[PDB]
Ligand binder design. Structure first.
Ligand SMILES: NS(=O)(=O)c1nnc(NC(=O)[C@]23C[C@H]4C[C@H](C[C@H](C4)C2)C3)s1
Ligand SMILES: [Zn+2]
Length: 257
């Protein structure tokens, strides 16, 4: 089944998931000179003060930190969004090398990794219904570069030893996702898709202009994870990113100049 290897990687996904060649696929290259400033875009509202993290899980393609999304505890609104979107999970995509790993690119530049905070539109009642709607999800994307350590990421890094292999989970309570945000909330936005199968076209992408910096040691610990389950041959979880897809009939908008 699908993955990031030579025989099941992004170039193969379209066989099981024909929408891979669809009209609003993600990620994309963000051409900063062609992105249109949109003065009517509202400031993002990130309200994570009441966030309740529950668990961290190695799902065989990345690790997800999951949140309680049965009430409005951590929500995203404003920006290009109408209504309220609840945080359900975050995860990362990263490379085998610092020069690659992000899914979105900026003027063709790849970052070392990319964080996705996934939210769903509460008007649809649950995440399963939301992914079937064109405005069902809002994903906040944040680039990572290697430099100084990100203090707020360290609790994540330190639990990875306990979820090395596919299917492993660990209690992960009281984690504050605010510690992963850059200083500025300036963003680009466009309509797109999930970047992993089923590749559903249900996402309003909000990609922050300002990367966070993480340390060499922090990203190295990401790369010690495994795609495989325990007792299966070891394959390091690296390069779990989908490359840029055709923009087609879409305009990327900027919240800033
Ligand atoms: N890379 S990306 O952000 O476009 C995404 N690509 N796929 C995502 N899938 C989900 O978010 C899931 C959310 C919760 C329910 C479903 C099962 C777990 C827990 C995963 C799907 S995000
Ligand atoms: Zn993702």
């Amino acid at each position: 089944h699908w993955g990031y290897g030579k025989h099941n990687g992004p170039e193969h996904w379209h066989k099981d998931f024909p929408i891979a060649k669809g009209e609003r696929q993600s990620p994309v290259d963000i051409d900063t000179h062609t992105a249109k400033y949109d003065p009517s875009l509202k400031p993002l509202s990130v309200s994570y003060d009441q966030a309740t993290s529950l668990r961290i899980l190695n799902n065989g393609h990345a690790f997800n930190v999951e949140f309680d999304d049965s009430q409005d505890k951590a929500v995203l609104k404003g920006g290009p969004l109408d209504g309220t979107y609840r945080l359900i999970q975050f995860h990362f995509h990263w490379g085998s090398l610092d020069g690659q790993g992000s899914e979105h690119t900026v003027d063709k530049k790849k970052y070392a990794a990319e964080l996705h905070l996934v939210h769903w539109n509460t008007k649809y009642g649950d995440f399963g219904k939301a992914v079937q709607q064109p405005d069902g999800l809002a994903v906040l994307g944040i680039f990572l570069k290697v430099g100084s350590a990100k203090p707020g990421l360290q609790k994540v890094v330190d639990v990875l030893d306990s979820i090395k292999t596919k299917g492993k989970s660990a209690d992960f309570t009281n984690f504050d996702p605010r510690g992963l945000l850059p200083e500025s909330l300036d963003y680009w936005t466009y309509p797109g898709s999930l970047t992993t199968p089923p590749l559903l076209e249900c996402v309003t992408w909000i990609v922050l202009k300002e990367p966070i910096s993480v340390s060499s040691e922090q990203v190295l610990k990401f790369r010690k994870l495994n795609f495989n389950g325990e007792g299966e041959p070891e394959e390091l979880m690296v390069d779990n990113w989908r490359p840029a897809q055709p923009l087609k009939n879409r305009q990327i908008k900027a919240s800033f100049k």
